[PDB]
Amino acid sequence: DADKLPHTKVTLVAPPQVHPHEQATKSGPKVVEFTMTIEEKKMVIDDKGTTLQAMTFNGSMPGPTLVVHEGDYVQLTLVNPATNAMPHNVDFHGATGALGGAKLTNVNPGEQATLRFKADRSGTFVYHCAPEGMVPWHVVSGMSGTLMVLPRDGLKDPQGKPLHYDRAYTIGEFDLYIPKGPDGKYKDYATLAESYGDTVQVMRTLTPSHIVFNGKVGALTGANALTAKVGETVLLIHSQANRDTRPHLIGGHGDWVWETGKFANPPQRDLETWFIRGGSAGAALYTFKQPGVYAYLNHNLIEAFELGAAGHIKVEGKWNDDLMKQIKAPAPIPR
Amino acid sequence: DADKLPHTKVTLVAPPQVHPHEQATKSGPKVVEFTMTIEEKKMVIDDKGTTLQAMTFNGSMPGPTLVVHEGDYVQLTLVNPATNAMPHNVDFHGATGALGGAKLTNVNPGEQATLRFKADRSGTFVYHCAPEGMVPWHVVSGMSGTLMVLPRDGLKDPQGKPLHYDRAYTIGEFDLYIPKGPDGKYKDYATLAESYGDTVQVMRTLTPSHIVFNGKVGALTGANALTAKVGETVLLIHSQANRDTRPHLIGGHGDWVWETGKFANPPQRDLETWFIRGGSAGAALYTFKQPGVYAYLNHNLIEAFELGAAGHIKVEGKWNDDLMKQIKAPAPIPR
Amino acid sequence: DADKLPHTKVTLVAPPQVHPHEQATKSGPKVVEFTMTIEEKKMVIDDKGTTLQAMTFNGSMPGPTLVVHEGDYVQLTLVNPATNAMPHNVDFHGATGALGGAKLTNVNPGEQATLRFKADRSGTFVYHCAPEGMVPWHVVSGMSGTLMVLPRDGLKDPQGKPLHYDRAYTIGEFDLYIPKGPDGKYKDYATLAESYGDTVQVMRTLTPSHIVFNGKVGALTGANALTAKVGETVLLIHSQANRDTRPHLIGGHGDWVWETGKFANPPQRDLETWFIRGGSAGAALYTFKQPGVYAYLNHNLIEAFELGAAGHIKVEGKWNDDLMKQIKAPAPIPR
Numbered sequence A, B, C: 001d002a003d004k005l006p007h008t009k010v011t012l013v014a015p016p017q018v019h020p021h022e023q024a025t026k027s028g029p030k031v032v033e034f035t036m037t038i039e040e041k042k043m044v045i046d047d048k049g050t051t052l053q054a055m056t057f058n059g060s061m062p063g064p065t066l067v068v069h070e071g072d073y074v075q076l077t078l079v080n081p082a083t084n085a086m087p088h089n090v091d092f093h094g095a096t097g098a099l100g101g102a103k104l105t106n107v108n109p110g111e112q113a114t115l116r117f118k119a120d121r122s123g124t125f126v127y128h129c130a131p132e133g134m135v136p137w138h139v140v141s142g143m144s145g146t147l148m149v150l151p152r153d154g155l156k157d158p159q160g161k162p163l164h165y166d167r168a169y170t171i172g173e174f175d176l177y178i179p180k181g182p183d184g185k186y187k188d189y190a191t192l193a194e195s196y197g198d199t200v201q202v203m204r205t206l207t208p209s210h211i212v213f214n215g216k217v218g219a220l221t222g223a224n225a226l227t228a229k230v231g232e233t234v235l236l237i238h239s240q241a242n243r244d245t246r247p248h249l250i251g252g253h254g255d256w257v258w259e260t261g262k263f264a265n266p267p268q269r270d271l272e273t274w275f276i277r278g279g280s281a282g283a284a285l286y287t288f289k290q291p292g293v294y295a296y297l298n299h300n301l302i303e304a305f306e307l308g309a310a311g312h313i314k315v316e317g318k319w320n321d322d323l324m325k326q327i328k329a330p331a332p333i334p335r
């Protein structure tokens, strides 16, 4: 009986980081408690000052990643402060029943609720807001994130050998539908409510205006690049709650990848590019072998470079000429 | 030799049901005989009364699912009544040769033809009309359905364990390209041929006006919701003859899924959302554990809730608080 | 050490053919040397005379396929002739470090460079141009191709059994973004640079004007249809550097398919339609069992038949009535 299990509290951290956690654990099932507080806020999403009347869990896109182990119970207190203007709820693709929890968590501004479910299936799973009658708007406006449910004995390759990472990063990719006025410029709305009708018109075209990692063009670049070093193994968690994407790490690979994001299935290896179906989260492991600034992107290259679905990984360490060597630098064609 | 095997006649049923059949069978190979009659008709596809100048196998979108076992031969009599305007035929993705049967089943109005092929590969396979030079149009206007070739000893998990279902449901998803006039309203055409030029313009934009399950918005909802109960295992067969989709059961999972639809391959488990490549049929098993109304949808949520790609499953039974419980109902935040 | 391994030179051949190679080999690792020369050129891409200001590796869309074996080193000399307008480079998805090679092969017109990398992972991998700030334009204008890294002991089925092909064909599929003038007709530009701004605005709409195999509508039809015969096994290599596609052989199957294109993973069998993610190359084997003209296409049928993503395979041999038979030819409905 779950009420009699030990309860532990986890403090969530902002993306792209993930809160500390164990992979293989000797611990038995717990009720792991989390709190998230909804925040509606206008956000600048590109270098030209275009804004999004956004909606978020915990003030970020994506929402923070919640990690537990298979057999644990997730107990979330969802808070919708009075400072907000719209109702919300939460649907966990990792949960069973009641439309993922959305039926049991309808919180209007000024309310909160607490939900518990058993995390009985391992994998990366999307959670997102889903108010009846306007699910897409709330999702495309920013309300999604990942629940990672690791197996108790950690991650395994297809032969049962253990796989281990030194660091997890979480990337949420958001297809945005920002309206334009008659002058062809993006509209800037004084209120969330005012953005609704025009935004739904754009959504229905199925053509996003921007596709961003972690909330804006350039979110994971420059000072905010992800970081690693040669010999380090990273897990890259990638969520897309509404639309397909095809992650790729330029100059690297997916050493082991769960593109459908479910760890009881054997991963695939050596992938150049993988595929995250809209409404899911997948995960890739990679162990760096070369230093340099890598790009991690959606390999529809228009969506990456023109619409924003690209970030970087700055990697420290020593260059390996056996893996790759510039035999002759760019020079005049022999005459 | 095929001519010397026992012949048997199966009566097809209208989607979303699937005609009665065995999973594991003791029976040996048979020539299984099916008849289908092409019906061109004007159908109402949304709640505003928009119409499609539709083309169907047997009067429904999708056509009925034909079920046989691996090793059986399928023998179809395709009738094109005199009252239709156009020539038609049939291409079975499950068959080998002559463009899937299409070159051997060219029936003009007033004609019929009979085709036999060996169903030597197990899986769900799309069949669709494919008249030379008119293929996209006949397919997007409704002419597709599923052939399921069950393995003789039934469905297997990756370790070879048997998987069994209590009820199969068949969902066809249709991307529709309905034209609009200068006033921005959907056009209503008196004849099939009248719809052609305008429909082709809309098709070339690759943007569907509507995406529907089983022929219309709301087809699998209300009185026509699918049904199940706690403890029951359903097989959800999903076809999309022209365009990708990404099925998801909200509040549930894909316990075992063949997203590429081919049963000699091992399935994957615990999927939140899977992927049906345009031009294919796939199949998912799920055993319900909670009662309630579930949504089964294409998890591009715009595609689902704005354009029509969603249905419901009403599930009877007892709520299980271990799996999910409302610890605290929505209430005001302590001030 | 790579410097001391034997070096051999391979002469590339024009798609759809692949240069002669072994599958299983007794040879040890080698540094395999290749040369490619970039050709910018205006090309006619459809039957009404529409032109693309194209960029190519070696004069063709796709660039030729490079075949080596796992553990070999690839050593490419990349030549950008004095007569081209733009800088180029190469990113091998099969290589590790320096953005796939891109940072080490920045060749302005009149320059060349030589890159070595270890092909330590088996599979079909995209290579494509990637000059900083112009990646999408160069890829969609035609600068991509496949590296096939064959395992030393050749292709294997899921149980470890060997799989052998008699002939490989390489199909590169290109989503094109050709601009239109105010009159609604496709623009025809005098120079490459003239095409830039307009092309970028089409690209951002995410809607291709054309999607073609090997450079143009009907490139692989008529006199240029691919060829085979009953009993022959072919390997069909399919690359898409920018956008998803869903290949299908009409009247056939993918007997064994690596849709993510990585040969250390077990393939899937009996596929009707497979899925090549944007930014990847995949591979399918089929053994022909019926003669006739097959269509090989992207099974979004609008993309295939309206936009151009279709070709043909003409197959010689003897019809097999057990696989498929016209029991009754089209004839009047009985009365």
Ligand SMILES: O=N[O-]
Residues within 6 Å of the ligand: A248, A249, A250, A251, A299, C091, C093, C100, C130, C135, C279
């Ligand atoms: O490797 N894609 O830029």
Ligand SMILES: O=N[O-]
Residues within 6 Å of the ligand: B091, B093, B100, B130, B135, C248, C249, C250, C251, C299
């Ligand atoms: O079988 N696709 O036309």
Ligand SMILES: [Cu+2]
Residues within 6 Å of the ligand: A055, A087, A088, A089, A129, A130, A131, A138, A143
């Ligand atoms: Cu919300």
Ligand SMILES: [Cu+2]
Residues within 6 Å of the ligand: A091, A093, A128, A279, B250, B299
């Ligand atoms: Cu969802």
Ligand SMILES: [Cu+2]
Residues within 6 Å of the ligand: B055, B087, B088, B089, B129, B130, B131, B138, B143
């Ligand atoms: Cu037809």
Ligand SMILES: [Cu+2]
Residues within 6 Å of the ligand: B091, B093, B128, B279, C250, C299
């Ligand atoms: Cu087809």
Ligand SMILES: [Cu+2]
Residues within 6 Å of the ligand: C055, C087, C088, C089, C129, C130, C131, C138, C143
């Ligand atoms: Cu280039």
Ligand SMILES: [Cu+2]
Residues within 6 Å of the ligand: A250, A299, C091, C093, C128, C279
């Ligand atoms: Cu690339």
